[PDB]
């Protein structure tokens, strides 16, 4: 008895500029009729060195809809480069899309975002300081940490 079961996620923001917006073509199946708005949020771990930095790129609200399996296309402008530390910026990070209905999260696509330089030289030998402008977000679609939960979409 869930109202939305997100199934597929065709990430478009595969390794592209860090200043390119997170593009998630999610295909979810609205299993039931909805009452409130569906809150898909993209949470970019602001520091994989400190998780409490988790930033929020955007949150799309899909209102009450009478079920239906279909795809929508997420995009969200990049995080604050100042929020990310060295080891995270030129490193591995996660950007999770927690679908949050009624303030209750019922799924989490923890897409590992591997931030590695765009320019081959910089991949050859990563500059000691993180260049978010040279940074390319490789959204590891080979490693989607999908953690979904069951929530009360109702008031029971």
């Amino acid at each position: 008895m869930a109202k939305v079961q997100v199934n597929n996620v065709v990430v478009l923001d595969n390794p592209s500029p860090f200043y390119n917006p997170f593009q998630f073509e999610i295909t979810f199946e609205c299993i039931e009729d909805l009452s409130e708005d569906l809150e898909w949020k993209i949470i970019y771990v602001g520091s994989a060195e400190s998780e409490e930095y988790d930033q929020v790129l955007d949150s799309v609200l899909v209102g009450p809809v009478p079920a239906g399996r279909h795809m929508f296309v997420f995009q969200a402008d990049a995080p604050n480069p100042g929020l990310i530390p060295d080891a995270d910026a030129v490193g591995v990070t996660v950007v999770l899309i927690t679908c949050t209905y009624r303030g209750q999260e019922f799924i989490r696509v923890g897409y590992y975002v591997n931030n590695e330089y765009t320019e081959t030289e910089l991949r050859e030998n990563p500059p000691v300081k993180p260049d978010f402008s040279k940074l390319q977000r490789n959204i590891l679609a080979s490693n989607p940490r999908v953690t979904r939960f069951h929530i009360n979409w109702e008031d029971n």
């Binding site: 949470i43 771990v45 520091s47 994989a48 060195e49 400190s50 998780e51 988790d54 080891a87 995270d88 490193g91 591995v92 990070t93 996660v94 999770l96 927690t98 949050t100 209750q104 999260e105 989490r108 923890g110 590992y112 940490r145 953690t147």
Partner: peptide
Amino acid sequence: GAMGKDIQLARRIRGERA
């Protein structure tokens, strides 16, 4: 320090965001 980036992220995904 936080060298284990993976596990940091694993935290947030497993149930740390919420």
